[PDB]
Amino acid sequence: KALPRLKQRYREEIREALQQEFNYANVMQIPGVVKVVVNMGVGDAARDAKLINGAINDLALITGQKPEVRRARKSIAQFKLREGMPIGARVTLRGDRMWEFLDRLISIALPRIRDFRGLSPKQFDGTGNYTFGLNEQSMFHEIDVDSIDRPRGMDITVVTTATNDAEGRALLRALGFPFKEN
RNA sequence: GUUACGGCGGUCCAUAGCGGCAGGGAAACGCCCGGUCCCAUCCCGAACCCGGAAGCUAAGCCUGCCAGCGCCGAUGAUACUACCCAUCCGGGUGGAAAAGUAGGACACCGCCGAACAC
Ligand SMILES: [Mg+2]
Ligand SMILES: [Mg+2]
Ligand SMILES: [Mg+2]
Ligand SMILES: [Mg+2]
Ligand SMILES: [Mg+2]
Ligand SMILES: [Mg+2]
Ligand SMILES: [Mg+2]
Ligand SMILES: [Mg+2]
Ligand SMILES: [Mg+2]
Ligand SMILES: [Mg+2]
Ligand SMILES: [Mg+2]
């Protein structure tokens, strides 16, 4: 009875546009976004685990889902890290949660991006993938700026079903992220 | 009986794998649609589980073709060696490799269950 505007968009207009613009043999060659990944590894828990709790608090308030933290999958003396210390916080999505969060992000954080300049095609990998790292956490609405103690990191990435980068870029710009003009 | 079907199985388990190419949705197979109730995410219906069959075979699977690569492999010879030898010095009979070579080769088969025919 309730469902996200991007879900509808995908069903009716994005799918039709991509089909027309690439002449797929079948309807569903249309790649579809698979997983929005939201993790973080500070690397500072090796000296103090207090900041990890705050980062997870930010992740929970941003998502409402309870992020996990992983240990030192290997151990490195140079990084002063031993296996078993928690360094990486994760929080994942799927489906309606994926696209509600994506709509909120596109509507709020992107126009809210200080000195926003658009994102380039070239950080793809040719297989329809898209991932990079957030300047600052404070960009988000539900988070409180008066309570942020130290500027820490967040990431909410997107992925595709695209076989190559061509379809990935086509559908992604159809969704309408701010690609550069070069 | 046929089948361009699904499970379980075999086999001194790659002649049976990998790679590229083409094709399959009647049923079955996958993907698939949504999470009140079972159940699960060290979060997520991603995994699993559950309700249903709107859609499609792209992925995966299958089958068919390709020698690009894996792969099997002669005869012959060579290496090797059991025994015996001749005043060292290597031969006589027996055994006979590895690699390389012509080539072979894009599995075969069993029991049930599904669509066409009797
Ligand atoms: Mg993709
Ligand atoms: Mg049918
Ligand atoms: Mg789901
Ligand atoms: Mg296909
Ligand atoms: Mg496939
Ligand atoms: Mg071999
Ligand atoms: Mg082979
Ligand atoms: Mg012989
Ligand atoms: Mg003797
Ligand atoms: Mg002699
Ligand atoms: Mg031989």
Side-chain angles (χ1 to χ4, degrees):
Chain A
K1 299 312 179 187
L3 208 67
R5 55 180 281 216
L6 284 202
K7 277 294 318 164
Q8 300 73 51
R9 295 201 68 272
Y10 188 94
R11 323 219 177 59
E12 68 262 351
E13 76 263 35
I14 310 282
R15 163 29 200 99
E16 169 60 85
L18 255 293
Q19 184 47 267
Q20 174 306 332
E21 200 258 303
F22 288 163
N23 325 60
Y24 306 0
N26 178 283
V27 47
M28 52 76 87
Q29 273 96 350
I30 67 154
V33 46
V34 152
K35 295 295 270 284
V36 181
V37 178
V38 183
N39 73 13
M40 201 75 188
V42 317
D44 313 329
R47 314 278 81 77
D48 74 79
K50 182 60 223 70
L51 51 89
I52 195 62
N53 330 289
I56 310 284
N57 294 124
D58 290 311
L59 273 302
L61 266 294
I62 187 166
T63 59
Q65 165 191 131
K66 300 56 187 141
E68 287 88 2
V69 48
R70 75 225 71 192
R71 277 65 56 189
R73 85 284 193 191
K74 349 315 172 191
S75 288
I76 299 302
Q78 195 269 351
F79 286 147
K80 348 201 174 189
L81 65 91
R82 153 79 50 224
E83 190 186 330
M85 41 205 77
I87 185 167
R90 190 181 206 103
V91 75
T92 317
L93 328 181
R94 264 291 270 271
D96 77 3
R97 275 264 170 214
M98 303 256 143
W99 308 5
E100 178 186 327
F101 212 79
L102 165 74
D103 296 22
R104 303 289 162 159
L105 177 138
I106 307 305
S107 310
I108 320 311
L110 289 320
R112 280 210 84 274
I113 289 154
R114 279 97 177 97
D115 49 78
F116 74 92
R117 306 318 170 102
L119 274 298
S120 168
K122 45 173 161 163
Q123 54 270 21
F124 254 44
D125 56 59
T127 61
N129 311 131
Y130 206 49
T131 200
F132 24 72
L134 154 55
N135 289 296
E136 166 64 49
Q137 71 200 106
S138 306
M139 195 48 88
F140 293 48
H141 211 56
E142 255 175 343
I143 70 169
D144 292 9
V145 317
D146 59 8
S147 310
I148 174 64
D149 297 327
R150 193 294 309 284
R152 29 214 190 162
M154 318 205 79
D155 301 303
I156 296 92
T157 207
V158 300
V159 79
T160 75
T161 312
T163 79
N164 90 10
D165 60 1
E167 48 262 14
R169 275 95 49 80
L171 53 83
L172 185 131
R173 190 177 176 89
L175 205 67
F177 305 113
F179 271 138
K180 319 265 189 198
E181 285 76 8
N182 303 326

